[PDB]
C-alpha cells in the first residue's frame, strides 16, 4: 500500500489536466431562518490548500462535495450556490457552479474549463447513487464523475470526514483514475498514524464523555498501544463500579460493568480511574460540591466531575508523556463549579505540548463545545476534524476512501 | 393594549395539570458527514430547561413543539428529534417520549394520555409542509391542530427566539389560539435587544466585522442614530475604504455597495470608525507574507486579511471606555494564525471590559467560532445571542410578528 499525496501529483504535471477534488464543503447553515446562509465557512477556508495548488499549477479542476444529508434529491436548501460564492472569494477566482450533478449543464461547464478554471458540482448527494449500498449504483456514478475529467484526469481526495463509508465521489472513483490524498486527508492520516501505528512513548490517551459503550472500541485498540489510558468524565463510574466501589447516584451503564471489569483484568495498569471525585446532591449548576475518595462515594450524591487529586495524578502522567490523545470531557463543564477537571487536563495537555510533547484533540466539531471553558487551539499539536471517520481509524477499522488510495494507478 | 406577560406571569395563573404547548428552540447542530443523529453541539437542549423545568415542577403537562434542520418536504430520518429527546430527558432527569407524529394519532394520543409533571416532545413540526407556509389559512389549520393537544384550558409559551421574526403556525398563529406568553429566553432576549436599541448606559460601542457589507447594512444604518460609534472590520471595511476613494488591491469588495457606504460615511462622519491599518498579504494562505500597511495605502498586489495593530489598540481603548458594547463579526481571517491578531484582541478587550462592568453582547455564528478558536471564555460576555437573522431584524427596527402577536390581549 503506498498512499500518493498532492505533491506527487503535483510532480507528475497536472497543466491542463483534468482534476477531480473531493473536497468537505460542508458547513454549516442557517436552517432558523432563510435558506442559503453559511454560519460558519471554516470548511471552506481549509479546502483552499489543496484546490489553490491545482488552480495555480493549470489543472482543470472539478469539485464534489456534500451539504447535509439530502433525503431525496435536490433539495433548494441544500444548494452548493453559497458554497460556490464563498469559495471564490478565498481562491481569489470564480467558481462555476453547475446546476446539476453530472447532468446537461455539469457535462458542458466540464467540457468548457481551462487551465485553472473550477466547476464545482452540485451537491453530490442530490445524486441517490453517491451513498447507495448497491456497489453497480456507486459505480454507475462514479464513471460518470470519470468522464467530467477524462481519462487523462486523476483524482483527489480532500474530505477525511467521509472516508470510512463507501461513496462513489470517494471510493468508487478512486478506482477509475490515478488517486491521491490531498493536503487536509494526508495530514489526518499522517496524524491518526502517530497514534497507532507509529508511537513516540510516553503515550498517554485521555477518554472523558458519558457512555463506556460509546468508548468501547477506542479503549480495546488503543489499550495495546497506549502507555496509559486516563478514564474520566460520566462513565469513569461504570469503570468505579467494575472495581467493586459504589457510585451512589452517579451515571452507570450496569450493562457494561462486566465489560469494564475485563478490560482492567486485562489491559493490566494501563487504565488510570480518578481517585476523587467531586459530587453534588442534585444536577445543578448551585449544588454544593463535595470532594469525595473514588472509593467512599455517598450514597445520595452523584458525581459530576474528577476530583484535585486526580487532575494532579493525571497532570503529572501528561508532563511526562510525548504522545497525548484527548477525547471527551472530565465531568459537566457546563457548570463552572464542576468544570475544574476539564480545564485542568486541557490545561495540562496544553502545557505538556508547549515543552514539546505531541498532543491531538478528537471529537471534531463536538470537542469545539468544551472550547467555550476558554481553551486556545493553538495550545495543541493537531486539532482532528474527522468525527466518525477518525475514530473509527482509531479503532483499527479499515476506511475505504484510505485503503482505495493506496492501491495501485489504475493502468 | 400590548403587554407580553412571561412565565412567571404565567405559573401565576396556575399551570397544575393544565397543558402547556412550549415552541423550543432544540435545532442543534448534527453530525452530515456520518451517520445521522449524532448531536454535535447541545447548547440549545442546554438553554432550553429553564422554561420546561420551571413548567415540570408547576405540575404542567407540557407539550414541546420544536424543528431540527429545514425537512424539504414530510418526515426526513435525518432530521427526527429521537436524539433530542433523549438529551433534553438526561438534561431534565425524566424521561422526554417523542411522539412518532406532529399532530397525527399518537400525538393526539399521548397529549390525551399526558399526567402532571410529563414533557412529550412532537415529532420535527417542519415534517409537517403547513408549519412554515406563506398562506395564513394553512399555517392556522395546523396551529388550531397543536392547540387541541393541550385542550381548551391550554397555555401557549414562546421560547425559541431565532424564529420569532418569521409567521411560522408554532410560533405565531398558535399564539393566537391560546393564552399566550413569552418563556424565559425570549423574555432575556427581548430585554438584551432593548439595551441595544432604546435606553442603555453610554457610550455604546459596536463592532461589526465578517464579509459583506449588504449582510449588515439595515443594522448599520439602524444603529448609527443610536450608538456612539461603530467600529467596522473585517472583510467589509475594505468596501467602505474603496468609498473613501482609496485603492484596496486585491481585497474582498462588494462594489455594489461602494455607493452606499460613501452614504453612510457623509451621513455619519462622527459614529463610523474604520481600521487605520491592515495586515495584508500577497495569497490567501496562512504562511504568505504579511505586511502591516496602512489603511488607506494598501498595495496593489496585496489582500488585506486583518486590522492592524494601531486598529487593535484603538478599538481596544474604545471598548475600554464603553458601558455597552455589541459585537458581531470576526475582524481578520483568524483561521490563518497570522491574521486572527485583530479578532483575538478585539474579542479580549472586550471580556476585559465586561469583567470591569460593561455590559457586552455578542451575536453571530462566525464570532461564536471565533471566540471558540481563540480561547475566550464564553462566560467573559454578559450575553452570546444565538438569535441570528431574528436579533439582526429586530436590531435593524423592524418589529417582528412572532413577538407583535404575544403583546396581544389574552383571550376571554
Same mark, same amino acid.
Given at each position: 500500500?503506498?498512499?500518493?499525496?498532492?505533491?506527487?501529483?503535483?510532480?507528475?504535471?497536472?497543466?491542463?489536466?483534468?482534476?477531480?477534488?473531493?473536497?468537505?464543503?460542508?458547513?454549516?447553515?442557517?436552517?432558523?431562518?432563510?435558506?442559503?446562509?453559511?454560519?460558519?465557512?471554516?470548511?471552506?477556508?481549509?479546502?483552499?490548500?489543496?484546490?489553490?495548488?491545482?488552480?495555480?499549477?493549470?489543472?482543470?479542476?472539478?469539485?464534489?462535495?456534500?451539504?447535509?444529508?439530502?433525503?431525496?434529491?435536490?433539495?433548494?436548501? =441544500?444548494? *452548493? /450556490?453559497?458554497?460556490? &460564492?464563498? #469559495?471564490?472569494?478565498?481562491? %481569489?477566482?470564480? +467558481?462555476?457552479?453547475?446546476?446539476? !450533478?453530472?447532468?446537461?449543464?455539469?457535462?458542458?461547464?466540464?467540457?468548457?474549463?481551462?487551465?485553472?478554471?473550477?466547476?464545482?458540482?452540485?451537491?453530490?448527494?442530490?445524486?441517490?447513487?453517491?451513498?447507495?449500498?448497491?456497489?453497480?449504483?456507486? =459505480?454507475? *456514478? /462514479?464513471?460518470?464523475? &470519470?468522464? #467530467?475529467?477524462?481519462?487523462? %484526469?486523476?483524482? +483527489?481526495?480532500?474530505?477525511?470526514? !467521509?472516508?470510512?463509508?463507501?461513496?462513489?465521489?470517494?471510493?468508487?472513483?478512486?478506482?477509475?483514475?490515478?488517486?491521491?490524498?490531498?493536503?487536509?486527508?494526508?495530514?489526518?492520516?499522517?496524524?491518526?498514524?502517530?497514534?497507532?501505528?507509529?508511537?513516540?512513548?510516553?503515550?498517554?490517551?485521555?477518554?472523558?464523555?458519558?457512555?463506556?459503550?460509546?468508548?468501547?472500541?477506542?479503549?480495546?485498540?488503543?489499550?495495546?498501544?497506549?502507555?496509559?489510558?486516563?478514564?474520566?468524565?460520566?462513565?469513569?463510574?461504570?469503570?468505579?463500579?467494575?472495581?467493586?466501589?459504589?457510585?451512589?447516584?452517579?451515571?452507570?451503564?450496569?450493562?457494561?460493568?462486566?465489560?469494564?471489569?475485563?478490560?482492567?483484568?486485562?489491559?493490566?495498569?494501563?487504565?488510570?480511574?480518578?481517585?476523587?471525585?467531586?459530587?453534588?446532591?442534585?444536577?445543578?449548576?448551585?449544588?454544593?460540591?463535595?470532594?469525595?475518595?473514588?472509593?467512599?462515594?455517598?450514597?445520595?450524591?452523584?458525581?459530576?466531575?474528577?476530583?484535585?487529586?486526580?487532575?494532579?495524578?493525571?497532570?503529572?502522567?501528561?508532563?511526562?508523556?510525548?504522545?497525548?490523545?484527548?477525547?471527551?470531557?472530565?465531568?459537566?463543564?457546563?457548570?463552572?463549579?464542576?468544570?475544574?477537571?476539564?480545564?485542568?487536563?486541557?490545561?495540562?495537555?496544553?502545557?505538556?505540548?508547549?515543552?514539546?510533547?505531541?498532543?491531538?484533540?478528537?471529537?471534531?466539531?463536538?470537542?469545539?463545545?468544551?472550547?467555550?471553558?476558554?481553551?486556545?487551539?493553538?495550545?495543541?499539536?493537531?486539532?482532528?476534524?474527522?468525527?466518525?471517520?477518525?475514530?473509527?481509524?482509531?479503532?483499527?477499522?479499515?476506511?475505504?476512501?484510505?485503503?482505495?488510495?493506496?492501491?495501485?494507478?489504475?493502468?
Amino acid at each position: 500500500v503506498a498512499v500518493h499525496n498532492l505533491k506527487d501529483l503535483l510532480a507528475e504535471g497536472v497543466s491542463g489536466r483534468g482534476v477531480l477534488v473531493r473536497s468537505d464543503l460542508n458547513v454549516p447553515l442557517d436552517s432558523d431562518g432563510e435558506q442559503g446562509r453559511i454560519t460558519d465557512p471554516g470548511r471552506i477556508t481549509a479546502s483552499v490548500p489543496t484546490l489553490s495548488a491545482l488552480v495555480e499549477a493549470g489543472a482543470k479542476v472539478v469539485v464534489a462535495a456534500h451539504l447535509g444529508r439530502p433525503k431525496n434529491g435536490p433539495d433548494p436548501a =441544500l444548494s *452548493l /450556490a453559497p458554497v460556490a &460564492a464563498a #469559495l471564490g472569494e478565498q481562491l %481569489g477566482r470564480h +467558481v462555476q457552479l453547475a446546476s446539476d !450533478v453530472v447532468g446537461t449543464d455539469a457535462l458542458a461547464r466540464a467540457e468548457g474549463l481551462t487551465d485553472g478554471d473550477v466547476l464545482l458540482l452540485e451537491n453530490i448527494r442530490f445524486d441517490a447513487r453517491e451513498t447507495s449500498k448497491d456497489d453497480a449504483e456507486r =459505480l454507475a *456514478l /462514479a464513471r460518470q464523475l &470519470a468522464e #467530467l475529467v477524462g481519462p487523462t %484526469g486523476a483524482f +483527489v481526495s480532500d474530505g477525511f470526514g !467521509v472516508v470510512h463509508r463507501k461513496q462513489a465521489s470517494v471510493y468508487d472513483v478512486a478506482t477509475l483514475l490515478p488517486h491521491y490524498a490531498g493536503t487536509l486527508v494526508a495530514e489526518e492520516i499522517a496524524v491518526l498514524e502517530q497514534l497507532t501505528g507509529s508511537t513516540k512513548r510516553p503515550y498517554a490517551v485521555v477518554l472523558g464523555g458519558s457512555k463506556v459503550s460509546d468508548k468501547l472500541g477506542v479503549i480495546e485498540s488503543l489499550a495495546t498501544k497506549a502507555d496509559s489510558i486516563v478514564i474520566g468524565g460520566g462513565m469513569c463510574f461504570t469503570f468505579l463500579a467494575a472495581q467493586g466501589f459504589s457510585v451512589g447516584k452517579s451515571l452507570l451503564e450496569t450493562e457494561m460493568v462486566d465489560t469494564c471489569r475485563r478490560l482492567l483484568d486485562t489491559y493490566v495498569d494501563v487504565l488510570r480511574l480518578p481517585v476523587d471525585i467531586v459530587a453534588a446532591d442534585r444536577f445543578a449548576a448551585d449544588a454544593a460540591p463535595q470532594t469525595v475518595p473514588a472509593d467512599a462515594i455517598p450514597d445520595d450524591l452523584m458525581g459530576l466531575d474528577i476530583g484535585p487529586g486526580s487532575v494532579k495524578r493525571f497532570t503529572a502522567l501528561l508532563s511526562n508523556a510525548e504522545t497525548i490523545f484527548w477525547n471527551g470531557p472530565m465531568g459537566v463543564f457546563e457548570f463552572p463549579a464542576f468544570a475544574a477537571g476539564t480545564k485542568g487536563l486541557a490545561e495540562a495537555i496544553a502545557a505538556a505540548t508547549g515543552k514539546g510533547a505531541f498532543s491531538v484533540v478528537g471529537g471534531g466539531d463536538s470537542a469545539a463545545a468544551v472550547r467555550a471553558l476558554g481553551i486556545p487551539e493553538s495550545g495543541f499539536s493537531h486539532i482532528s476534524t474527522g468525527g466518525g471517520a477518525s475514530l473509527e481509524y482509531l479503532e483499527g477499522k479499515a476506511l475505504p476512501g484510505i485503503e482505495v488510495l493506496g492501491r495501485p494507478q489504475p493502468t
